């Protein structure tokens, strides 16, 4: 139909995050059979192949930002590919990798629909700046490049010349934040970004939280929704095989729930599954739980609802 029409983009890129090993992100999610587990319900699945990530050998660092140009080239390439698959009328399933790719994943999505919304389900806001981080790791600076209210204040870090900030600060909702460095929360409070952290998640209940999140984004006007989803935003009892595990995340139930509310609007238009890392599970059973989690999250995004999915013929026959 309109929804569950999928363009898969595997993006094995790592240089935004330091723990090398997330480049077996799309490989493990595909060998866990995400394609065929879509194909039971009416999923128009078209794999577009993995993106080539060239290696700039002299990707010389910035002041704090390190590996900048590889990240910027990867996200520009992904912005072109996301714009391609959104001109294909599909829902962009862009899975990596790391949050560095979400720059172009939101950018190329805005190249077709400039008035979308971002549900950034993550343990962290990932809105550090190149100037006021202390890491310089670009797996936590995608959102700072994308907000128009931050323009004139973001440095011209190389690789990011193509970057146009494309989303508004009032057009993004964080859900499941649980570890924020101080620069990101000043940005969070000064821009007036609406957010439901694990405080507000527990306060309203996850259902009233998704109710008010859809009342904030879609309560004004129907518009495309871009669920960009980290897998450390869930609790590390379910996904310990991630890059930055922080205890106290969402239960696996509620992660599936957030995806199902985004489905039952019928307005899912872009999906990111980042920070999957099979190299950091202490046992392969940890990796198995993590990858089965992220697969079933992606299933419940496109309408593998826990209520049921059907084909409209009589089955008493």
């Amino acid at each position, epitope marked *: 139909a309109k929804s569950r029409t999928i363009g898969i983009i595997g993006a094995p890129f790592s240089k935004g995050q330091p723990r090398g090993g997330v480049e077996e992100g799309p490989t493990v999610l595909r*060998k*866990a*059979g995400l394609l*065929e*587990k879509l194909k039971e319900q009416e999923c128009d699945v078209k794999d577009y192949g993995d993106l080539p990530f060239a290696d700039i050998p002299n990707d010389s660092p910035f002041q704090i930002v390190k590996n900048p140009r590889s990240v910027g080239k990867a996200s520009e390439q992904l912005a072109g590919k996301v714009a391609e698959v959104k001109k294909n009328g599909r829902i962009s399933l862009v899975l990596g990798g790391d949050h560095s790719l979400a720059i172009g994943s939101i950018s190329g999505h805005a190249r077709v629909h400039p008035d979308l919304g971002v549900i950034w389900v993550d343990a962290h806001t990932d809105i550090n700046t190149p100037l006021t981080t202390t890491s310089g790791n670009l797996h936590g600076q995608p959102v700072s490049f994308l907000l128009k209210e931050l323009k004139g204040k973001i440095p011209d870090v190389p690789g990011f010349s193509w970057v146009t900030p494309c989303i508004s600060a009032k057009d993004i909702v964080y859900i499941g934040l649980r570890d924020v460095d101080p620069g990101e929360h000043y940005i969070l409070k000064t821009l007036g970004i609406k957010y439901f952290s694990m405080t507000e998640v527990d306060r309203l209940g996850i259902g009233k939280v998704m109710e008010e999140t859809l009342s904030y984004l879609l309560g004004r006007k129907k518009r495309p929704i871009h669920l960009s989803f980290d897998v450390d935003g869930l609790d590390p009892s379910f996904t310990p095989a991630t890059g930055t595990p922080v205890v106290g995340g969402l239960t696996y139930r509620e992660g599936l729930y957030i995806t199902e509310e985004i489905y039952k609007t019928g307005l899912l238009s872009g999906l990111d599954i980042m920070e999957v890392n099979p190299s950091l599970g202490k046992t*392969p059973e940890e990796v*198995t739980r993590t990858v*089965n989690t992220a*697969v079933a999250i992606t299933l419940a995004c496109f309408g593998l609802a826990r209520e049921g999915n059907h084909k409209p013929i009589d089955y008493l026959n």
Partner: antibody
Amino acid sequence: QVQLVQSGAEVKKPGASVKVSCKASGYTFTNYGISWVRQAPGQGLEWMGWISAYNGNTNYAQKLQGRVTMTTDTSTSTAYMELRSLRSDDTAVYYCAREGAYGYRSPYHNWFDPWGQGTLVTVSS
Amino acid sequence: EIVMTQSPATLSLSPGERATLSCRASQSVSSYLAWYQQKPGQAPRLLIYDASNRATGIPARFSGSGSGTDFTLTISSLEPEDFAVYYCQQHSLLPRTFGGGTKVEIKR
């Protein structure tokens, strides 16, 4: 017809494992489930782990929990089995066969009907 | 670890009559086990699927029974291509043990 083309006969010291390729065909995959069984020569046989190809259900055996890993590759109907902390008791022919997926959409099956041709693995240094 | 015991350890019967074999369980497997045809150095192909009913490429003569402790493998029309080490194997208890060995020789 319904087969399993395995691969392949390989010896390892006590060290790294033998990810045994167990390629399926004929029957529709993820409508069934592939398991594993060791056989030392001149001995009986021990089943050692079964996965459902339906959804990643690991379900290993006793005395190796732990030592075994088993995944799917269900793009191509193959399934795999590695090992860990290998040992000279594992001088065994490794067979894979199809127990049927014990999920919900998967037909009644108890009985191992593809059998693969085997894999000569002797753990000797 | 239910031990499956095959009461004919060896077997040597001419091309000819019935070659009824026995496999016993230490519990009630209850019509949940199979029968195999391990030729030397080959694929131990399935003979009989769920204590009966003769799976999918079986020739004519491989009936068997059970349900539920001590089972039978009948080779009625012996057919001398069938000289192989046979195995019953319980299934519906973990871990899924096997029989011992049923070397069907040639009687001469």
